[PDB]
Symmetry: D2
Subunit: 447 residues, 4 copies
Amino acid sequence: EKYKNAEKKFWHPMGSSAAPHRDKTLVIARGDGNYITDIDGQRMLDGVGGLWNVNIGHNRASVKAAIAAQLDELAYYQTFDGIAHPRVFDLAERLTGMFAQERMARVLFSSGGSDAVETALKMARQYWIASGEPGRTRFLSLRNGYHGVHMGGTSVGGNGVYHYNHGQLLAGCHLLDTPWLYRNPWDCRDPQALTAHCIRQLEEQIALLGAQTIAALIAEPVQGAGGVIVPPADYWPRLREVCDRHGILLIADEVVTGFGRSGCMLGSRGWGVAPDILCLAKGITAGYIPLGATLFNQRIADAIENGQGFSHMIMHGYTYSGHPTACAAALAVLDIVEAEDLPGNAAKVGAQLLEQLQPLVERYAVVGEVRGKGLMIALDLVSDKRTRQPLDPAAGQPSRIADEARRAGVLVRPIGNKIILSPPLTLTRDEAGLMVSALEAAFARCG
Amino acid sequence: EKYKNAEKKFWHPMGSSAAPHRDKTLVIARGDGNYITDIDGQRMLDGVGGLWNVNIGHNRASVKAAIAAQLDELAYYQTFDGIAHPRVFDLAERLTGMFAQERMARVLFSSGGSDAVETALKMARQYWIASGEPGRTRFLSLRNGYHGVHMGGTSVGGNGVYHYNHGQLLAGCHLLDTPWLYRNPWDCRDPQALTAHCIRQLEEQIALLGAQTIAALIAEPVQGAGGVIVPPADYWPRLREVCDRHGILLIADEVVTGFGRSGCMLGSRGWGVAPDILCLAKGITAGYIPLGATLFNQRIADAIENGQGFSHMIMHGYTYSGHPTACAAALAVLDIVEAEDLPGNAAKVGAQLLEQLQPLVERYAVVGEVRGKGLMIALDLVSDKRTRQPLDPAAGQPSRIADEARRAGVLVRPIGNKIILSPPLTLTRDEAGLMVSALEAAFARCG
Amino acid sequence: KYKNAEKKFWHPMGSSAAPHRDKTLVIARGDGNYITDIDGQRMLDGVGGLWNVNIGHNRASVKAAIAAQLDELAYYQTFDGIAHPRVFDLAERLTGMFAQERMARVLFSSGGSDAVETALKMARQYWIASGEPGRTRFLSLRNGYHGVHMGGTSVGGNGVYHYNHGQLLAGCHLLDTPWLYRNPWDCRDPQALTAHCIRQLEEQIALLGAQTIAALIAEPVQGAGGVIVPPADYWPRLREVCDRHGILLIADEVVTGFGRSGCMLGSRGWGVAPDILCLAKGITAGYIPLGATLFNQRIADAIENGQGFSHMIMHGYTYSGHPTACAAALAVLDIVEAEDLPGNAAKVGAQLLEQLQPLVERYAVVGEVRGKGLMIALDLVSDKRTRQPLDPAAGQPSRIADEARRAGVLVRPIGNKIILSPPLTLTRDEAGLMVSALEAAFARCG
Amino acid sequence: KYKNAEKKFWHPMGSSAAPHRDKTLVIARGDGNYITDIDGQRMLDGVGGLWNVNIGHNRASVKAAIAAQLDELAYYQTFDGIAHPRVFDLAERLTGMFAQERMARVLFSSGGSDAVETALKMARQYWIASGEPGRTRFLSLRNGYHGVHMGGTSVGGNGVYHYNHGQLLAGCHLLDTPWLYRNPWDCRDPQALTAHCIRQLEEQIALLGAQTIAALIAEPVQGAGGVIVPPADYWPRLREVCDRHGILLIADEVVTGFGRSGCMLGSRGWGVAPDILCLAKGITAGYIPLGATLFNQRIADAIENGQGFSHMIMHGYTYSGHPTACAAALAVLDIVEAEDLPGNAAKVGAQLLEQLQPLVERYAVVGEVRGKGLMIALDLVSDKRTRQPLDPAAGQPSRIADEARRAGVLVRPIGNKIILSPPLTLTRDEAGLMVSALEAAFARCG
Ligand SMILES: Cc1ncc(COP(=O)(O)O)c(CN)c1O
Ligand SMILES: Cc1ncc(COP(=O)(O)O)c(CN)c1O
Ligand SMILES: Cc1ncc(COP(=O)(O)O)c(CN)c1O
Ligand SMILES: Cc1ncc(COP(=O)(O)O)c(CN)c1O
């Protein structure tokens, strides 16, 4: 196959479009199980899980059969006002049943995580208007938080790299510090003291703005793309409490943590917390078909459906909201997740994997720390152990380590100064050891 | 089946969430060709084409086989920085080739039309920053224009119904009147005289704002959801001229008109105009798999890839950008479009259909006019002929007319006071006749 | 000897580029309706300072009032629970003058931009106190001018004030102005033009949603935008459409306030009571900076009865209610009513507009000259059939203005228009002097 | 007969609700550093008007300057190409006094909110003339106060001025203030606190991108936020971090300007030259409303050399450069320098701060007393360990103030803090009188 010399007419998301870098490509040809093979026939463990989303593994027959079945019946029809089809009923009933613990009542379907976030922001605005409180407009989010790249979700993202090239977006969006033990304004390495600092900052910000102007707070139960930041255990419970003091809606961004990666069917549930809104994508279809979903609890659902006048008009949604093929594939994916206890496998093998990575910290100066929860882990590379200053990605050392890991048979993901591990949730003890061995080799080479 | 009494745990886009309207459902079970069947076994012509997107018809074998083939090889992998797969190469190559007339150079893929708009807006901002002119940030668009429901695309929409429930959105978006012969501020029923009014208004707005602050103008070559507003023939050729006068980027939202619906492979091409950015979705995969695409010409592409410093880093994109299964299906769909000359069939049967609907205007007082181009047509219903004041949808007569058409075997779409016709582009003379008859019956019963 | 002096200040509304910046007409003295430059040359003050020296320069009684107050209390604050005699007097006086508009409370300031900014922020507070925090958007007119604070800039209808300052307040929307000379419909019938504009206003409200619209702001006669006199039925309809939607109507009376257009209020001159009044300029006849924003009983009752923090008025200025400015204002209002200055403005202004019409006939560059009372503008165009404005960058409007001064009458070029706005004490034959000086100016530089 | 009079104005910064609305201390006369109410009771003016009557009330020379100018030319405009003697004089005077700070141009206005708005809008214009219109965002500090125009409100660091007005200007970002008594780090070491705050600022710049940031605005001593005196190394680092990125440093000197904190500029007292100066209040000692915004050579050269429309300054006010205000300003600046009022404030302020320390020891409700020169605040708390501020809505800070007045000294409650800011001519005897009256007030109402 001659894709090696092929000219590139598309743009890589999240990469330099400048030559000559633009012309480098790792071209993946085939995937099966938790392994992928490039156009050069070299095979590597898929330590990134696609983009933490191929959580059941590549080429699952049952899911492929579900898609084929639905295509023969009805690949697509719309669900706009008064029209629907069987598959959207099935998954909406299914999703609300799985998250009854969070009193979720209604689903607004979409095609991806940014859709789910964009939907959560605009519908949070609608909830307050239907409740007779149109002053509730502002949004809170956390540093290093990532919520997609639609303009709404871009506006609440806590990493500047996604902002710089696009100008002023939504006004009235405010950032809070994240409870990050490795790097935080207080140099605080104690979890209870760090949670308390962050919550006190949150109350002060709420008071300054006036709670009556704030529509929602959005947060990832484990911050993924920002560097696998695992908050302290009491942070999310005290998040829920503070939002309740002011009636502020709590949006859990579960796009990455949804359906098991961190050890629980929800990251918010894993912390013992019921948010007001759930945002889901990625693993929901295990990447097989684009699908996103935003779930709303009974509180929000009741207000909007009883809203007066135009406030009960839901003028938001997508041509492919509730896509029959997408739903069909989703149902098959959820069956595997529950049947094979993929949340349980993630909690077990992830801990084992995290344990095996700790000696890297002592062995290699460039390894600052290794953190994780379930099967999301980040290796934080620093230039200085004492000050925890990140490596500069422009020097290119993190991708060089990544390349050598790949040559050793395991694809992992550099983001800035951090190597992300996010394999399928079916990862075994054996494969977890393979990942350990390849990173050890990469740091011996390029550490 | 027992979906008739079933509980509804999802929200219909573009509809009242209030009871009792919420509990009523037309549940479509199966599709073949241009016909759909509901859970009560009633067959009807798909006069809406899903949501003007199933342009080749339901249950096309070739497309399903292309989907299955790709699932066996690699259903999904990412295309983030330096990583890709064969299908995204093929489809990006194919698209730039189909639109070489427009000098299209790069594609940023996504999953739907709202993505395609959001991406064009955000990347237009990056174009100007990379070209060293970050003061170029504002957006122009048209009244009645519809561009999706992400916060960006919502900000530039020209119909208030999408704005009311969501608060303040993106600043610096400015609306222009649309060259709509039936209803316009000048009561102008002469095409050249109306184009002059609107272009003159556009010049005045640019002068008022300052061209150096204006990034792009976005417009549909035929306005779809705003009511099938067909601009005068010189309108778009004069849009291009004015945008060129000031260096403003012209974004053609081709989500509906893209790939043949209005009689040409592009609506902008159909007016003889090469825009700078294309927004595509819907028919690109004929709805079988969610896919969106935004194309950028060489001008924009060279500028961004040659941008200094951080301006050549494209930190915008999606988990499912370049989805292999979506691309595989898209490639199969484009074969049919060109092989069966689907734009030409749309021009021909569309004209025939439009001609056959004209006697409705004389026969039914409630019919104000019937307009269209290709296989997008709208019947504009009024209460008063001389003032052309729209029927109020809250009275429900347009929905009653739509229902009666369905009972006569043709599903059509009420939007506001207008009945939208947008069936598959494979529509035959025979099927067009059934649509005329079903409307004639509907207007006899509920007109 | 200020002629060669180096200039360490910036002229508002002018080129800061060299060498243009280095020129100066330095006014040394003022008395009555005349001024004297540093070269001892006198001229009629055809601009009235900046349409604000409406009683004339060097009125003894006003200076006597200022001296009296300085001896007693030049300044004290009027923040929560503290005030002084003069602010009681002036607030009582202003609310008395505008009982026809049901004015109940005054929030004082120092200028027109202050008053507009105050009207905008307090409109926001009114709705919040009324339990409707969704009411935030603002409407205003094309060519409208409302000062240069960021709020007032955001609602300005002329681009020249926007270009150099970036993104300001969101949710501000412009409407076309009912200008018979130039409008989007090329409508030359006043009744048809008002109908065009109101229909557009109704359309904009529906597009935006009235429940999101806080207020509409408009000048009864648009001054700096070029003396655009609206049709007589425009302002009554305006009031009615806003009442349809509960939208507050802010009348910008900074220029028209106290008589220039023939009535103590332009809004009253059209028979309309707005919800908020913006006043400045003539309120003290320019002798001391003062501004005022007045609110009707509707607004006052809502804010003063607001729940919790919503009745806290956390807006105001160090010099809100300044005693000496108030002292001066009281003396100025005495003269305005005693000498019926609105009545003189109507009568002599009409006379003057009549005397200026032959200029249009004689000089191609004169497109039209319009006015109401003692605000008048001559519209200079490059083409009669297209009404295309003269380009100010060519400098012809500046050159006609210079020759008028050489003929003894100082006038004001704004863009392509010459503005006439002398004191409201103008006499029948000072108006004759103005006609002769312009005729000379257009003969020389037309 | 004003006590029973109906109140037709609104007090800024106070409840407009009945029955609070109609309680009023009516000041009738002012002379020296004392004021007299309508009941003939005199009290020391511990608030200085509103920290602006810095030379005292009823200064003969200043009154004479005002009268002299009124006889000559009370007002004329300074818009494009027109000016008058007094504005030249004061512009030259101000740029000379601040030659150390390289100040080059003045844009005059009428108050502190004007001066702030002008600094913000011209900061936007500077970057446009420099070819960098992407520079739009503004930084400021928590508890910082910069007036009540929509611009200045947008950068304000206290919620109380925001709650009733909805969404204002976007792209304004707040930084924590280096306040040793209350800070997010509970940091009680001044060097360590400066390090926390500068580290935070570097993080903010990185997240936003320096190329999007137009200016940072801050008071050299934060006034209305509670007299927060920064550590001595804070402002030097502010300058240095701003210089790393070309970000403009706006010093809000409305209160600290001309001596209150011991120096002609607060920024100068920290050894720093900002790019922009905002001045008001004491500039005329309250006698006539005046504000001024000064710009350094850097900004002046860029704007005056800007291409095309970028050198047109379409910002300014009818009363920009008001002659009578300038005349008074010149007379006041003579007194400020001749009587070394910055030094008197430094010496008597220190003395007063020391003498106020025994109050802290004696009354639980006094959390701490801080100050620099003659701006001092007593910080009232409900609990000494948690530093929780007193709630102003409970009214105890006002009751304490009321008894202080009854003891002959007028002081100012703002929130939970009693502000002392008397004229800069304060004598050791009067400083002791202020201590004696506060000691009495806390014995009664503490
Ligand atoms: C937490 C979270 N939020 C939102 C998104 C956006 O998802 P998508 O790429 O499907 O648009 C992502 C993508 N990584 C995410 O990690
Ligand atoms: C012109 C246009 N652009 C954008 C969109 C958004 O498409 P999607 O629903 O797939 O997001 C639509 C959908 N009707 C559209 O009509
Ligand atoms: C109509 C109007 N409103 C407000 C203003 C602003 O007044 P000031 O310059 O005193 O701030 C002006 C001054 N031209 C004005 O003409
Ligand atoms: C620091 C500061 N900034 C600006 C202002 C606004 O001043 P003014 O009241 O004259 O508008 C104030 C008012 N106290 C101030 O203290």
